[PDB]
Design an enzyme around this catalytic site. Structure first.
Site, PDB file in Angstrom:
ATOM      1  N   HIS B  52      12.067 -36.693  14.444  1.00  0.00           N
ATOM      2  CA  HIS B  52      12.606 -35.437  15.202  1.00  0.00           C
ATOM      3  C   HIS B  52      14.040 -35.007  14.332  1.00  0.00           C
ATOM      4  O   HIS B  52      14.515 -36.146  13.831  1.00  0.00           O
ATOM      5  CB  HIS B  52      13.173 -35.529  16.640  1.00  0.00           C
ATOM      6  CG  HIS B  52      12.002 -36.090  17.837  1.00  0.00           C
ATOM      7  ND1 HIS B  52      11.921 -37.529  17.791  1.00  0.00           N
ATOM      8  CD2 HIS B  52      11.273 -35.608  18.502  1.00  0.00           C
ATOM      9  CE1 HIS B  52      10.754 -37.369  18.429  1.00  0.00           C
ATOM     10  NE2 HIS B  52      10.503 -36.247  19.057  1.00  0.00           N
ATOM     11  N   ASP B  55      16.823 -37.443  15.331  1.00  0.00           N
ATOM     12  CA  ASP B  55      16.828 -38.719  14.936  1.00  0.00           C
ATOM     13  C   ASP B  55      17.296 -38.985  13.591  1.00  0.00           C
ATOM     14  O   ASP B  55      18.064 -39.937  13.504  1.00  0.00           O
ATOM     15  CB  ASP B  55      15.274 -39.230  14.665  1.00  0.00           C
ATOM     16  CG  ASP B  55      14.496 -38.989  15.695  1.00  0.00           C
ATOM     17  OD1 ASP B  55      14.906 -39.088  16.895  1.00  0.00           O
ATOM     18  OD2 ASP B  55      13.336 -39.028  15.603  1.00  0.00           O
ATOM     19  N   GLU B 215      -1.940 -38.301  22.653  1.00  0.00           N
ATOM     20  CA  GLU B 215      -1.440 -39.681  22.499  1.00  0.00           C
ATOM     21  C   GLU B 215      -2.302 -40.612  23.520  1.00  0.00           C
ATOM     22  O   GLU B 215      -2.387 -40.113  24.764  1.00  0.00           O
ATOM     23  CB  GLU B 215       0.089 -39.761  22.810  1.00  0.00           C
ATOM     24  CG  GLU B 215       0.567 -41.015  23.000  1.00  0.00           C
ATOM     25  CD  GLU B 215       2.147 -40.965  23.162  1.00  0.00           C
ATOM     26  OE1 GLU B 215       2.517 -40.295  22.094  1.00  0.00           O
ATOM     27  OE2 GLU B 215       2.992 -41.627  23.968  1.00  0.00           O
ATOM     28  N   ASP B 243      -1.680 -39.747  18.160  1.00  0.00           N
ATOM     29  CA  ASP B 243      -0.439 -40.907  18.468  1.00  0.00           C
ATOM     30  C   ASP B 243      -1.212 -41.966  19.262  1.00  0.00           C
ATOM     31  O   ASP B 243      -1.985 -41.717  20.138  1.00  0.00           O
ATOM     32  CB  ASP B 243       0.763 -39.987  19.023  1.00  0.00           C
ATOM     33  CG  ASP B 243       1.704 -39.447  18.165  1.00  0.00           C
ATOM     34  OD1 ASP B 243       1.323 -39.328  17.002  1.00  0.00           O
ATOM     35  OD2 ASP B 243       2.517 -38.813  18.896  1.00  0.00           O
ATOM     36  N   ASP B 290       3.203 -44.030  17.860  1.00  0.00           N
ATOM     37  CA  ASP B 290       4.367 -43.612  18.777  1.00  0.00           C
ATOM     38  C   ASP B 290       4.183 -44.659  19.856  1.00  0.00           C
ATOM     39  O   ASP B 290       3.759 -44.229  20.978  1.00  0.00           O
ATOM     40  CB  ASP B 290       3.944 -41.881  18.979  1.00  0.00           C
ATOM     41  CG  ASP B 290       4.852 -41.529  19.797  1.00  0.00           C
ATOM     42  OD1 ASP B 290       6.278 -42.090  20.065  1.00  0.00           O
ATOM     43  OD2 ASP B 290       5.009 -40.478  20.648  1.00  0.00           O
TER      44      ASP B 290
END
Lengths: 392, 392, 392, 392
Positions: B52, B55, B215, B243, B290
């Site tokens: 991101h 981050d 995810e 993910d 993730d």
């Protein structure tokens, strides 16, 4: 209050006719006569009745019998003024459908399932129904290696394309509504949510003929927000029909009276359907109750429960209107900026080039000052609830 | 086994870098330097790293600071040979996004949200990223009346069309993947399941540029079958990214190592992805983890957990391969008729007219005899588990 | 309706003082001053305030500091006339507690955990608190092999036995209330439901001193009926305290205002606590609100949400009373045989020998006939809901 | 792997005998003759069989018939060497029990339910059964105002106290095991979890004769950790029997083969039961499978599924044994301090005063330093799964 035909309350024959045989016990009520059902529902305010082929005509009825039943059924409708807004087909009870109808691993079952539906389409067209509801209750699996999902979606599509073809060619003018359900009776059912069902319909040959028929309890079985899912369905213009009932989250399908499960969400749903744009309802189809009178009840409890569905919808309607008409609510809506979401993010004619040029949208934007201001959502929610409790 | 670059295992900077500050407690780990994370990941076999914006570059870094970070970052990538296959934007941490990014009720926040993303697209395109993942974690509500869903979907679409435009005009060649999540941090999140995101994507100006990034735990948070939803995403051809993690049904988002949640679904997922049609995998993008190293662990536990993700995937892959090469499993598949679902239900050139004409499809169909044949699904499931258990 | 000291509404310092830093974002509100909190709560009608040690005195304050804070706090209490009915200890925030306080695998943390609580007991004793609430938020595990449950219960018991010893020697007169939660922050927490906590307490050395402090939302995270578990707790006489809030089924802990989640269950709960035995409440302790003002709100929202809690309770109380006073409800209760359950199954002095001699209890019993009579439960439920909506 | 009588695998006659009539369809299998079931089970390795009165003798059989059936059944056990470790009574199927047996609001139903059970107790004693299992499937409600929980618990207690009196007086030496279930078929069932059942039993007249019979899927229906719950039951010494099966979280009761649902939990469970203190199992009773052969199967599928249960249990045991025997696991257990939880928190003879005088437990304690060491839990967990997977 009192229900009018304009309220369009409809009920399935299998709802008030449920004999109460559950997974763990025998039926507690005797069978309901369809003509009587027509009469009883007409009396409580319903404007229409619906049914599965097999609810009306017993599975394996000779032509004579079938014909016989239909004619009596047509008379009752005649006499009472009730219409048949939708019809559906039972592709879940008979043992042959244990692995599904349209997506059974067995090819002969798939062919049979299509035939069974074509036949109900004919009866439906003859009774004046506008919608064919399709609930794939046995489409799915208990074990992942037992079902090729991709192939099952191909076969599901293949069967629907054909039904559309036939209907268009016979000039029936039917619309098709797929009913999603996450599980029960299969461990996992295909097209588990309103979302999955809409995505699927978009892949059909004449997508304009297909929509969905979401049920309150089905979305709640996965703990999803029913009102929010219906708001998305409406955004897509795929709300062809709706099944109303109650549920207490992720557990077996309860089929309670509408509003007897998640009361707050039943309130917001009625608000969304009725307090549509331009004052008018956002939805104009049938308000269909797919519920079951509890097993602890006799025939009196059965009519009582039928009436409760109507009373709940009308009581909620009344409070949703009062809610929107309240000046203090109007003031709370403004403070919460609910309507500011309707104004485009971009000014007319602005594209990325103009957005990139606006220092105020990034370089000179004070995220910190904006982040400190509250939206007043709790107060707005409290006002909604006080309207629901009749405390304002 | 050992991971190869061909395995395409990737990790977000925010996974091994999670400091373990949860909703009820302080961080238990100190911050991880991005260059160090690059080196450690390369060393365990990852082929890529994702991040991101916030981050890598602390929210509010001056351009000199940001430039320096990016340059050191690029040097590490260079030296290790790791790539950046996907980038994403943080539209959920800063207080300004408390009511969402693209769908905040506040217009100015929506304008700022788009600019934050455009800036990240530039950096992604310069690092060679091919996918931009969009996780609208703050798009939603805690109360039904606080958010107009229809207006929200309009605003969501309005932002996404602009991004596609910019990308196409700049020749970035990015693909966009929306990541669905049912709830957390909002009471209810918009586009709650893979199905809802797919249906939404179909309404954009350039749908071909849009897919999903589902995810594992997110679908499990609604108690849905992840493998079955992935199968449908593949059928639509919208699986742009994936993910992988672990979860124990409906509860807060756990983000466990892949396979540490629902092991049986993890197994059937690896079978689906790798044992695709034509020997080859059904999916070719990154296998992204993730997840979060548990709060009880120190930096040794962090690297152990990063390696556990890869081990888990490779062990399940080996077992999935053996499963399918087993003549007993093949025999069970044949008896269960899995492949027969892949054969059209209709004969070549057969239409409704011919189907209506086939008495073997209805008039002479013995539903009762067919209904009594077992599918052998339990036995098939048992062989699958014996392979996973390494008992076969 | 306005709140009286007699209503006994209490709030934790940490509810209104929650800065809204969640698992995915920064705090959106500044810190609330404790003296300020006491003053504001006194104003909205609260009769008491509660706190964790660390909410009042920042972790690690020197004695001078600590001493200063307490003095100011007591003065605010004094001035407003607010009491401290309960106190608790923060055994979950600091990293040392990552694997638990009383049940941490590490023996030294366990020792420290006890010392931290003894210290809080002295302060609670000093302020006049009657209950010590223990929320074992970090007791549990993410993986089954990481925690020996048996040994953990031995250690939980070892610690509580000591606390009771100390209180009793010192003449503090405290009652101890264990607070159950199924999960969050740990994958699974020890003593997950009201039942598990009651069963556990029955095994301590002075059980008479121990009870539970159930929270609406915690039972709902497992989809359990909160009212029904409270009824069982009352039956055991172990309801020592109660934490009221709102939740929407199994998902992260929401901590909504009481009545904003499952409204029907909030209604039946108020009925149970208030329409007790005589005419009198069935429960006489504090009505404590353990909630969180939504992250989207500023301090105006905070005070609005505090008031909403009291308002929901008083509004539900009013309708519960009306419900019970209605002749139509009395009639429905009679038809459903609710009160017949209170009559012993056996006649006075009847044992198994007399029952066996009663041909009418079996040999001549017409089960078919009894099984055909309805209980009229839907109708009773419908009357309750109409009372809730102020429709009667 | 082969099953021995020392494995103590038992099956209910209603498991392999389930005709597969679910809530949405007719039976797909014909009825199983009790005598045949006895021969088949003996054949696949079971040591015992259990049944509900109505599973063996059709509800309403005359004594002649009833007597005849018992005689034949008795012969089969004779010839095969199978024993009847437990019996239960059907207090859920017949319409008369629509509101419960022991807690029906109707007094006459309550008297009748007791008689039904005393009779079954007689048969149990004659066949050598040692445990009477009580599954209160219909005790509970769909609506909160319909059932006085307190009155219900009084009536449940009254009935159980009589049953123990009778058994003790007739010298039957039975143990009573209450089986908890959260819901299905009632909206909510009384004593919803292992925890609630244990707390309740503690209030009976002769509590030493009462325990629980927890079922895997029942606890998983609320998303609870079954292994952790069993651990608690064991700590209390109330694990009198155990029903093993599989489930996929909160949804209808699936009753899959043991280990076909949450496989990781199935593994930690076998480890808990078998790797008891000092080599020996922690549990000594029957390992009873209360499952259902999927509706898609025929009798072939039925026997297959019966054997799958045994197979699953023996494969898991084998891996649980290997897990514990592994020196690397032994080392990881040490690093994670799992066994340190067994050391009392307090030194021998140490009380509050000695603890308060120990500066190392508080004043001189370095929480920050201890807060930073990892527990190595992910690594231990990964070792367990590699053992389960047969990769170690």
């Amino acid at each position: 209050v009192q229900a009018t035909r304009e309220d369009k309350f409809s009920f399935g024959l299998w709802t008030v006719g449920w004999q109460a045989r559950d997974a763990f016990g025998d039926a507690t009520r005797t069978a309901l006569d369809p003509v009587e059902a027509v009469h009883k529902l007409a009396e409580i305010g319903a404007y229409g009745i619906t049914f599965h082929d097999d609810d009306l005509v017993p599975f394996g009825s000779d032509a004579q019998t079938r014909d016989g039943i239909i004619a009596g059924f047509k008379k009752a409708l005649d006499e009472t003024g009730l219409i048949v807004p939708m019809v559906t087909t039972n592709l879940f009870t008979h043992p042959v459908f244990k692995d599904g109808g349209f997506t059974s691993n067995d090819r002969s079952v798939r062919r049979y399932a299509i035939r069974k539906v074509l036949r109900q389409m004919d009866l439906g067209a003859e009774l004046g129904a506008k919608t064919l509801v399709l609930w794939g209750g046995r489409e799915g699996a208990e074990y992942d290696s037992a079902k090729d999902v991709s192939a099952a979606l191909d076969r599901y599509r293949e069967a629907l394309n054909l039904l559309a073809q036939y209907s268009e060619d016979r000039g029936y003018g039917l619309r098709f509504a797929i009913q999603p359900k996450p599980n029960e009776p299969r461990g996992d059912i295909l097209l588990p949510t309103a979302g999955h069902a809409i995505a699927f319909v978009q892949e059909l040959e004449r997508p304009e003929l297909f929509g969905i028929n979401p049920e309150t309890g089905h979305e709640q079985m996965s703990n999803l927000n029913f009102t929010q899912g219906i708001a998305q369905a409406l955004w897509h213009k795929k709300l062809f029909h709706i099944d109303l009932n109650g549920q207490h989250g992720p557990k077996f399908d309860q089929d309670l009276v509408f509003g007897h499960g998640d009361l707050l969400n039943a309130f917001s749903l009625v608000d969304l359907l009725e307090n549509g744009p331009d004052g008018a309802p956002a939805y104009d189809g049938p308000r269909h109750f797919d519920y079951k009178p509890s097993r602890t009840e006799d025939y009196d409890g059965v009519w009582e429960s039928a009436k409760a569905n109507i009373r709940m919808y009308l009581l909620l309607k009344e409070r949703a209107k009062a809610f929107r008409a309240d000046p203090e609510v109007q003031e709370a809506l403004a403070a919460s900026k609910v309507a500011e979401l309707k104004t485009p993010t971009l000014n007319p004619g602005e594209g990325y080039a103009e957005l990139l040029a606006d220092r105020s949208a990034f370089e000179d934007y004070d995220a910190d000052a904006v982040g400190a201001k509250g939206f007043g959502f709790v107060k707005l929610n409290q006002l909604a609830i006080e309207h629901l409790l009749g405390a304002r």
